[PDB]
């Protein structure tokens, strides 16, 4: 402005100078600085280079310290001065981050000023033990029919989204994030889910497109986007998931419910492999370090569902894994499959057969299952799952085709649970074995339009009770038969 | 027996041999004479004749071994110095002799309270204020420590003072100050 | 407006700094006195 750039952006700047313990860069190359000195620096402590850069002290060797650089090592020369910070790596946590795009260290990259964060939180904290947790009961609503019906997800669960490239994993995550809009602006406080999206190793314009999609649907007012893109140093892409997880643990520890998507963890594993090979640590399978399973398990163990003596918070994780040529038996895919509480398998064969989302219901699993569902969706989805199985072994058969064409869904169109259960009702009770599949989606579009235009009271009772009572079942029978007559 | 740790730790084979000799002489109260003897043998082994003889890799080992023993008994050294040169000659570490003497010298230096202190300015500064700087920085030391100053000038700091005493380090240069205030003004 | 307010201000923030480096031995005395205050 005209005076507001000196008044406190200068006069208040903490220009103090103090005696600080330092070291000296012996060598620097490929983002790994070997610092002589720093006798009292702690393991995994954040240090600071004389050129404004920052780094984490990973290797504590007898003659030097292996400092990984959070940035570009072009600015660092031999003989530079590395000053301690005294604190292990920590990120700013709070509610102010909601609506911001930050990098792996919590700095704003959307140009909207500093985050007004009061508290900070380590990134390498310990997950809650056995006592602070409780069973995963509340449902996390995605708005996707196949997920919310056959692979339901709870609050506190770790559901893996796994598939090849360009199969629809990011789209599943984006639908899940957009769907929480109805609950977030509503009245019931313990149905609000604050989403978090971690972009690891992605192209920067992809994250720009994603932020545009999430702000077009007004879904950014409750979403944090941590982004360690492909041009960011390997330590930043390795630290992004832990930063995002701490930002979500803030909510989880304070009676609120959060959701975090790691998109994806294959690139975090690759960044960690690079960062550890450059530290001269011996490689393992596929040159990955020995402790990459630990790298992912200590991260996915922090997604918990706390009990009421701890606030009743929650943190649902949705790790993403890319596989090479459908090879699910690789190293990192098998690690993360062993860690998580279920999977959502996507295939390109199903994707090109018109089945979108290409969720393989045969392989998709939810280890919690029915415990993470509403009663009405459970009532319909049991029979729907069994009928879809019966169709998949004999690929009745027309009812199964009708059900699969019912499962198909568009992009960025997350339905409500009430509408979802009404559709799968109209599908499993028999009112669709008369239409030809090439008009099934037409019927559902028109039927949803009609029901949301005329029958808000039935859907309101569905949303209030959670059960499809005999009164509700009869009224829904009425509506579906009359519309089928109209169609 | 068990070794005594020097006040500083040097690493590599140079550090191994220097720590060995420190533990050797400290067990016999002979650190200073062996310091002198090792600096002397450094002078001796930077001789063109002897350096071109013993650093020659295709000269047989026992030949340079006996040559070192000859010059070592001629120089009237302590048995510790003789044993060290013989042990370096057996293991084939004649290239590491001045590395070992340098590590031992810095061990003895840090043993004598000598802390390395460095001050930096844009241009060479007064010697009276240099004595004031010495006396003031002496306060950052324990009693029994010694000031060993190295004042280098760096005109890129635009003025100020960059003091590094041992590993403690204060940055009073105005270049880092304008950098700090500028990053504060931008964010 | 926000486009002009941004670039003009960042040009402003660049003017002052390459101007102050253009623009004194009391600092070396101030550094000696400020060093004694560390204790």
């Amino acid at each position: 402005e005209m005076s507001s750039i000196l008044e406190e952006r200068i006069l208040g700047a903490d220009t103090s100078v103090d005696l600080e313990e330092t070291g000296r860069v012996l060598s620097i190359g490929d983002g790994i600085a070997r610092v002589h000195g720093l006798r009292n620096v702690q393991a995994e402590e954040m240090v600071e280079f004389s050129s404004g850069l920052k780094g984490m002290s990973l290797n504590l060797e007898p003659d030097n310290v292996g400092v990984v650089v959070f940035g570009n090592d072009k600015l660092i020369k031999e003989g530079d001065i590395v000053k301690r910070t005294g604190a292990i790596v920590d990120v700013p946590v709070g509610e102010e981050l909601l609506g911001r795009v930050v990098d792996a260290l919590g700095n704003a990259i959307d140009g909207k000023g500093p985050i007004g964060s009061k508290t900070r939180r380590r990134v390498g904290l310990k997950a809650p033990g056995i006592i602070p947790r409780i069973s995963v009961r509340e449902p996390m609503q995605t708005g996707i029919k196949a997920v919310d019906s056959l692979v339901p997800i709870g609050r506190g669960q770790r559901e893996l989204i796994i598939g090849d490239r360009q199969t629809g994993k990011t789209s599943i995550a984006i639908d899940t994030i957009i769907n929480q809009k109805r609950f977030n602006d509503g009245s019931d406080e313990k149905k609000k889910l604050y989403c978090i999206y971690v972009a690891i190793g992605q192209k920067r314009s992809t994250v720009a497109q994603l932020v545009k999609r999430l702000t077009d649907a007004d879904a950014m007012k409750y979403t944090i986007v941590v982004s360690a893109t492909a041009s960011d140093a390997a330590p930043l892409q390795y630290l992004a998931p832990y930063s995002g997880c701490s930002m979500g643990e803030y909510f989880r520890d304070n009676g609120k419910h959060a959701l975090i998507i790691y998109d994806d963890l294959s690139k975090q594993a690759v960044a960690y492999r690079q960062m550890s090979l450059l530290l001269r640590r011996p490689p393992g399978r596929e040159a990955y370090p020995g402790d990459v399973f630990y790298l992912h398990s200590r991260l996915l163990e922090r997604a918990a569902k706390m009990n009421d003596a701890f606030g009743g918070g929650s943190l649902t994780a949705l790790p993403v894994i890319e596989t090479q040529a459908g090879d699910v038996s690789a190293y990192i895919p098998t690690n993360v499959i062993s860690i998580t509480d279920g999977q959502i398998f996507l295939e390109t064969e199903l994707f090109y057969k018109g089945i979108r989302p290409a969720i393989n219901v045969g392989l998709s699993v939810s280890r919690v299952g029915s415990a993470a569902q509403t009663r009405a969706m459970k009532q319909v989805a049991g029979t729907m799952k069994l009928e879809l199985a019966q169709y998949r072994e004999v690929a009745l058969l027309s009812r199964g085709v009708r059900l699969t064409e019912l499962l198909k869904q568009g992009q960025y169109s997350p339905m409500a649970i009430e509408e979802q259960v009404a559709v799968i009702y109209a599908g499993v009770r028999g009112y669709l074995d008369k239409l030809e599949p090439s008009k099934i989606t037409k019927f559902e579009n028109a039927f949803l339009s009609h029901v949301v235009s005329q029958h808000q009271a039935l859907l309101g009772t569905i949303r209030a009770d959670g059960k499809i009572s005999e009164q509700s079942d009869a009224k829904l029978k009425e509506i579906v038969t009359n519309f089928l007559a109209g169609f | 027996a068990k070794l005594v740790r020097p006040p500083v730790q040097v690493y590599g084979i140079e550090g191994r041999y220097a720590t060995a000799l420190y533990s050797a002489a400290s067990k016999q109260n002979k650190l200073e004479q062996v310091e002198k003897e090792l600096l002397r043998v450094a002078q001796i082994l930077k001789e063109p004749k002897v350096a071109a003889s013993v650093l020659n890799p295709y000269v047989k080992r026992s030949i340079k071994v006996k040559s070192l023993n000859d010059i070592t008994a001629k120089e009237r050294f302590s048995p510790l110095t003789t044993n060290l040169i013989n042990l370096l000659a057996e293991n084939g570490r004649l290239s590491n002799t001045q590395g070992v003497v340098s590590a031992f010298s810095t061990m003895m230096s840090v043993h004598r309270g000598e802390v390395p202190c460095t001050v930096t300015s844009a241009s060479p500064l007064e010697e009276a204020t240099l004595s004031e700087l010495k006396t003031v920085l002496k306060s950052f030391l324990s009693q029994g420590q010694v000031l060993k100053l190295e004042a280098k000038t760096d005109p890129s700091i635009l003025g100020g003072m960059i003091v590094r005493i041992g590993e403690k380090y204060v940055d009073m240069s105005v270049k880092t100050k304008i950098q700090k205030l500028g990053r504060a003004m931008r964010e | 407006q926000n486009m002009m307010r941004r670039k003009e201000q960042e040009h402003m923030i660049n003017w002052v700094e390459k101007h102050v480096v253009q623009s004194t031995i009391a600092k070396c005395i101030a550094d000696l006195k400020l060093l004694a205050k560390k204790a």
């Binding site: 005076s3 000196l6 200068i10 | 205030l181 | 402003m12 101007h19 600092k27």
Partner: peptide, 15 residues
Amino acid sequence: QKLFVDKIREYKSKR
């Protein structure tokens, strides 16, 4: 405080 005054002078000079 050559840098206290400069940051407030040079900006006031920018006025």
